[PDB]
Amino acid sequence: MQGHPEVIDYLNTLLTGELAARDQYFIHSRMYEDWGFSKLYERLNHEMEEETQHADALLRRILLLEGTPRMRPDDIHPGTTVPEMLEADLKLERHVRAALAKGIALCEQHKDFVSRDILKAQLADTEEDHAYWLEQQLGLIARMGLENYLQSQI
Amino acid sequence: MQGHPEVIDYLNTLLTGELAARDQYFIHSRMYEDWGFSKLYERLNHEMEEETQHADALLRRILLLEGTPRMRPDDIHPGTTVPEMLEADLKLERHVRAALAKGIALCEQHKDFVSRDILKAQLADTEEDHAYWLEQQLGLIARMGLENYLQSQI
Amino acid sequence: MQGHPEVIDYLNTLLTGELAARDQYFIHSRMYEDWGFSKLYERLNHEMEEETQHADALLRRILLLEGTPRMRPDDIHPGTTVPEMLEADLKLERHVRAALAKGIALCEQHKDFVSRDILKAQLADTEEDHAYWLEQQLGLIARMGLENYLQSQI
Amino acid sequence: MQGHPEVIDYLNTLLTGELAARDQYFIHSRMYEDWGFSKLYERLNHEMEEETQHADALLRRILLLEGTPRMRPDDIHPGTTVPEMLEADLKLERHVRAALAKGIALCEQHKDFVSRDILKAQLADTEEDHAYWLEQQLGLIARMGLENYLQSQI
Amino acid sequence: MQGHPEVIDYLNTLLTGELAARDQYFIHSRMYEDWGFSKLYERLNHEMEEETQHADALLRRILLLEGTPRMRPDDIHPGTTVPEMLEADLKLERHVRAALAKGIALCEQHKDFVSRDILKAQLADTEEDHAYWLEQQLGLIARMGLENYLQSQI
Amino acid sequence: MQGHPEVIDYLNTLLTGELAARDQYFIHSRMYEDWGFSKLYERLNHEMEEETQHADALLRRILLLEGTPRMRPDDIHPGTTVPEMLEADLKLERHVRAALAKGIALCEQHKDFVSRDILKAQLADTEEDHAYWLEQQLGLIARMGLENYLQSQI
Amino acid sequence: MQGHPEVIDYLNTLLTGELAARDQYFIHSRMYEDWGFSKLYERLNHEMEEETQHADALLRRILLLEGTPRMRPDDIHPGTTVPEMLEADLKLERHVRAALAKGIALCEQHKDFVSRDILKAQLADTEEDHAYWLEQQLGLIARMGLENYLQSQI
Ligand code: NA
Ligand code: NA
Ligand code: NA
Ligand code: NA
Ligand code: NA
Ligand code: NA
Ligand code: NA
Ligand code: NA
Ligand code: NA
Ligand code: NA
Ligand code: NA
Ligand code: NA
Ligand code: NA
Ligand code: NA
Ligand code: NA
Ligand code: NA
Ligand code: NA
């Protein structure tokens, strides 16, 4: 079934964003492990896997709609310290959140209700899992201090 | 069996207090989870369930005595920081403790020995479980500092 | 993430409604048990638990959106006989249904698609589980008579 | 193997009748569930499945005989109350019974002894299971009254 | 709860379409088995069951909304060869897809958000399961030839 | 119990036919194995066993009726290539089908209803299992070509 | 431990190559699934996972050596038909093979014997698993023809 060209193009925009999110969590998780914060490694490794699944869902939807997936990831922007890495991931998730919400509205406009539902599922993950957890970590650093927070992530 | 009107009225006073205690622990537990203190979430979630059971016991006793339960909870007074929330819960439990003790004396006066026993069981829970745990948390904050205490509740 | 103030306010309106629904099912279920209708006790006890979960989902969403939950339940309006209690619960569920549908439209307007999805899930429960079951009970009373219906609920 | 054209045509007549019987039990069973008579839902849901199997056996026999199955169901005639629905199903089963008996005689005449045996199996189901159960329900309504009967089917 | 008449009418249009889809897959699956293509029999038999479930969901929703289900299936249009049968099923699924998308928009317009969600679930099945699989089979025939494809379906 | 001489004689005619069918499937199945078509070996080996059981049922019925079984098999007519062997078996099964149908009519005429039932069971096997499968194989060869069909039977 | 800058730079070159290989197998595997070649999907999905592990090993080695990983994948070059996709993957693996062999020699020169061993393990995978399998598939197409080969990959 040929999808609407505007929807396919927009799904491709989201795909390159999620390929990038995957890769930013790839490098951050391994940096956290390099420093000995295995709890941070585990969480972000899980997030890398979740973004790979999100990318996969978009890629397969684009194919179903007879489009050609764009596989070049967006640029990533890793941090150099734990607070910078948390903030960088939160900025990325906030961007993905806004992009997904714009996509949902576009899908509704072009009456692509299945694509809308795929994006809604990803939007729920972004808001309620990914971004929320990051906000929590930054809030913990604010409440107990960075040194105590880092200790908790060994 | 028709209970004594003064006893039924007093049980209703306790019921609206325990419905409120339930709801204060509902909001506090979820606030603790929002901030990432899952140990505090778990404890206060348990306390919400225990207050629901306490309320249930009163409600069912009032019905047995042919009274009409009052289901409007008392006002609650949540805190805005972990120390404020602990103190607010401790103030509430201290109020419930005093109210329950007054109720036990009233039940004895009107020779409602089963109602007295229900209240005694709740009084033991209030003193030895709920209020004691809160006093302990505040004491821990005093002994190790707030930042270390918060770290321990992740 | 700061949610839209109109959405947060509306979620709070729904929250106080579901806290009330919880408490109306609390008193009705225990009244049904007081009279010996254990099948009615079991169903409405289950419904109390489901409304607590619905309230919980709203409360947690409001927190995520950086709002402050309103924990005062709406007034409840219990019945005094089995037919009155069924009708009172059905009136409440019909009100909740309309409120949820209005909320879904508001969330769509403000592009809060995750809040919309939470409300849609609750709307499906309200229509297809809660209200439908109540309509069925009233229909059974109409078809077999109240005395036979009550017998069936022992 | 090419079957006798008169036999194939007659099997097709039976097929469209059993496709209809399937669909009448589909709507009646779901109507019974809509009203809260889950015992009636379960029985007629089972009967829908049995008529689908009966239709399947005819369809496959028609194909084996190199015929072309007729897939348009006969018109159905659902009732609007429990007694009307029972009577409507009994009228349908009585029609199917007569049609099957006529088919058995035709198959014997054209020496299609396997088709005869398929129809005999369906005839036994119609008489001893489907129609008999319906006759029993109507007899129960006659003996205990409709209200008691409906109570028994919750 | 009385549903909107335009929504109920439209659900009935979808119901008669899915009853037809059920029956087209009924005849095609058994034709595939008649020829010895058991893999095609199994898939389309599964699809018949899925369309029966889709029809069931619509029928039950129409009843809940106090409507009267229309049980006459639309006409079906079976093929006479494997490529014709695949194409006929794909044409049917493309029609169902468009009808479901129009229904979702109508439900949104009349603020029947639960009916919309039921249709969205069916739309996802139609696009991502039913039609996609058919497109794949036709593509396989194009890539390996019909004779090799048929061999693979024994 | 002495059976009717015409029935016993006719059962003996069927017996020598089924002893022959057994032996034709014996040689064909082993020829298929000799060439490396193990799927054809397995099917026809199964068919040899089924014809032995059919012969056994006739033999035992003839004895019960105080007749003397005729144990000389009819001549067999094996093919020399896979298509010839399939056709030869189909010709044999078509002959057995006609003979069994004539026998059923004779048994009915002489009121030997148990012998009729034994023959009906064998007739169903012949039509719905043996001959049908052969027709399917020849149809597969027609649809995918002989070389692909042979490949599928390795 | 600070690694040799020439070795770290070269590991980064290999990393961006393996991130690209991962993504080329991501798109090819999902294209194969889109067309219904599930055996090809499974193999290339496995290869995507293996390249992710290869990339991970390089990334972690670069971190250990106090380098900064380069996370931008090389450009990929997907095919548009099964033979083109196989050839494109084989060209990529041949490039990776040569790059890894050059890296091993460089590591030996700079006496980084652990980095050499990591690359040797990847070189064995590339030659004996990835490239070999691709060569085999192309050889199969040459020996049995493309249509038969595609049939085998359903
Ligand atoms: Na994502
Ligand atoms: Na994310
Ligand atoms: Na510490
Ligand atoms: Na208490
Ligand atoms: Na307490
Ligand atoms: Na609710
Ligand atoms: Na409800
Ligand atoms: Na009764
Ligand atoms: Na039937
Ligand atoms: Na029947
Ligand atoms: Na459907
Ligand atoms: Na479908
Ligand atoms: Na036989
Ligand atoms: Na035979
Ligand atoms: Na082949
Ligand atoms: Na590699
Ligand atoms: Na490789």
Tokens of F16: 């020598």
By C-alpha distance, the chain A residue nearest E129 is A64
Tokens of B28: 């506090």
C-alpha distance across the termini of chain E, in Å: 50
The reply to whether B77 sits in an annotated binding site is no
Identify all chain C residues contacting A132, using CB atoms and an 8 Å cutoff: 64
F86, amino acid identity = L
Main-chain phi, psi angles of G112, to 5 degrees: -105, 80
Rounded to whole angstroms, how far apart are CA atoms G103 and G99?
6
- Closest approach of A148 to chain B, Cα-based (Å): 7
Measured CA to CA in angstroms, residue C50 lies from A27, B53, C56, C130, G105 at distances of 42, 16, 10, 10, 66
Q: What is the DSSP string of B105-139?
A: HHHHHTT-HHHHHHHHHHHHHIIIIIIHHHHHHHH
A125: CA distance to ligand 2 center in Å? Answer: 7
C87: CA distance to ligand 8 center in Å? Answer: 23
Which of these, D27, D125, D14, lies nearest to D73 by C-alpha position?
Answer: D14
* C-alpha radius of gyration, chain D, whole number: 17
Is the minimum CB–CB distance between E152 and chain F shorter than 8 Å?
no
The reply to whether F49 sits in an annotated binding site is no
The sign one gets for the Cα dihedral A71, A77, A79, A84 is negative
CB contact under 8 A, A145 and B147: yes
SS3 breakdown of chain C: % helix, strand, coil, rounded to 5? Answer: 80, 0, 20
Neighbours of chain E (3+ CB pairs under 8 A): A, C, D, F, G
Do F and C touch, counting CB pairs below 8 Å (3 needed)?
A: no
The reply to whether F54 sits in an annotated binding site is yes
Give, for E85, the enclosing helix (H) or strand (E): helix E82-109
Which of these, B149, B122, B134, B107, lies nearest to B57 by C-alpha position?
Answer: B122
Which of these, C92, C93, C97, lies nearest to C119 by C-alpha position?
Answer: C97
Q: Are A144 and B144 in contact (CB under 8 A)?
A: no
Q: Three-state SS for G68? A: coil
By C-alpha distance, the chain A residue nearest G15 is A27
Which of these, C138, C57, C62, C54, lies nearest to C97 by C-alpha position?
Answer: C54
Rounded to whole angstroms, how far apart are CA atoms D138 and D130?
13
Residues with Cβ within 8 Å of F108's Cβ and at least 6 positions away in sequence, in order, are: F116
Give, for E64, the enclosing helix (H) or strand (E): helix E38-64
C-alpha distance across the termini of chain C, in Å: 50
Q: Are F22 and F79 in contact (CB under 8 A)?
A: no
Neighbours of C152 (CB within 10 A): 17
Rounded to whole angstroms, how far apart are CA atoms C141 and G39?
60
Is the minimum CB–CB distance between A113 and chain E shorter than 8 Å?
yes
CB contact under 8 A, E30 and D56: yes
The sign one gets for the Cα dihedral A67, A73, A75, A76 is positive
Is the minimum CB–CB distance between F104 and chain D shorter than 8 Å?
yes
C-alpha distance across the termini of chain D, in Å: 50
Is the minimum CB–CB distance between B136 and chain A shorter than 8 Å?
no
Rounded to whole angstroms, how far apart are CA atoms F64 and D146?
56
Residues with Cβ within 8 Å of C129's Cβ and at least 6 positions away in sequence, in order, are: C50
The reply to whether A42 sits in an annotated binding site is no
D151: nearest CB among C137, C139, C152? C152
Three-class secondary structure assignment of A115-147: HHHHHHHHHHHHHHHHHHHHHHHHHHHHHHCHH
Residues with Cβ within 8 Å of F60's Cβ and at least 6 positions away in sequence, in order, are: none
Q: Where does residue B36 fall: left (phi above 0), alpha (psi -120 to 50 degrees), or beta otherwise?
A: left
Q: Pick the ligand that lies closest to the CA of residue C147.
A: 8
Q: Three-state SS for C79? A: coil
Tokens of D120: 């005999």
The reply to whether C42 sits in an annotated binding site is no
Q: Are B97 and B138 in contact (CB under 8 A)?
A: no
Method: X-ray
G149: CA distance to ligand 16 center in Å? Answer: 26
Main-chain phi, psi angles of A78, to 5 degrees: -70, 155
**CATH value at residue F100:** 1.20.1260.10
Tokens of E82: 């494997």
Tokens of C49: 């638990």
Rounded to whole angstroms, how far apart are CA atoms A87 and A93?
10
Rounded to whole angstroms, how far apart are CA atoms D75 and D24?
9
Rounded to whole angstroms, how far apart are CA atoms A21 and E10?
42
Which of these, C75, C64, C78, C16, lies nearest to B23 by C-alpha position?
Answer: C16
CB contact under 8 A, A135 and C111: no
C144, amino acid identity = M
Q: Are G134 and G89 in contact (CB under 8 A)?
A: yes
The reply to whether B42 sits in an annotated binding site is no
Q: Pick the ligand that lies closest to the CA of residue C144.
A: 8
- Domain with D36 in it: 1-154
Residues followed by a break in chain E, C–N over 2.5 Å? Answer: none
A25: CA distance to ligand 2 center in Å? Answer: 9
Rounded to whole angstroms, how far apart are CA atoms E123 and A114?
7
Tokens of E31: 């034709």
Identify all chain F residues contacting E147, using CB atoms and an 8 Å cutoff: 143-145, 148
Rounded to whole angstroms, how far apart are CA atoms G124 and E131?
43
C18, C41, C45, C59, best to mutate vs chain B, most B CBs in 10 Å:
C59
Total residue length of chain A: 154
Count structural domains, chain F: 1
A122: CA distance to ligand 1 center in Å? Answer: 6
Measured CA to CA in angstroms, residue A58 lies from A96, A97, G24 at distances of 13, 15, 16
Tokens of E24: 């087209």
Find residues 116-135 of chain C whose CB sits inside 8 Å of chain D. Answer: none
Which of these, F23, F41, F24, lies nearest to F32 by C-alpha position?
Answer: F41
Which of these, C138, C136, C54, lies nearest to C100 by C-alpha position?
Answer: C54
Chain-centroid distance, C-alpha F27: 14
The reply to whether A46 sits in an annotated binding site is yes
Tokens of C132: 């439908």
Chain-centroid distance, C-alpha B72: 15
Q: Are D151 and D38 in contact (CB under 8 A)?
A: no
C-alpha distance across the termini of chain A, in Å: 50
Cα angle at D97 between D94 and D103, to 5 degrees? Answer: 145
Quick one: D139 exposed, middle or buried, by C-beta within 10 A (0-12, 13-18, 19+)? exposed
Rounded to whole angstroms, how far apart are CA atoms C48 and B52?
11
E124: nearest CB among A1, A111, A117? A117
Is the minimum CB–CB distance between D64 and chain F shorter than 8 Å?
yes
Q: Three-state SS for E58? A: helix
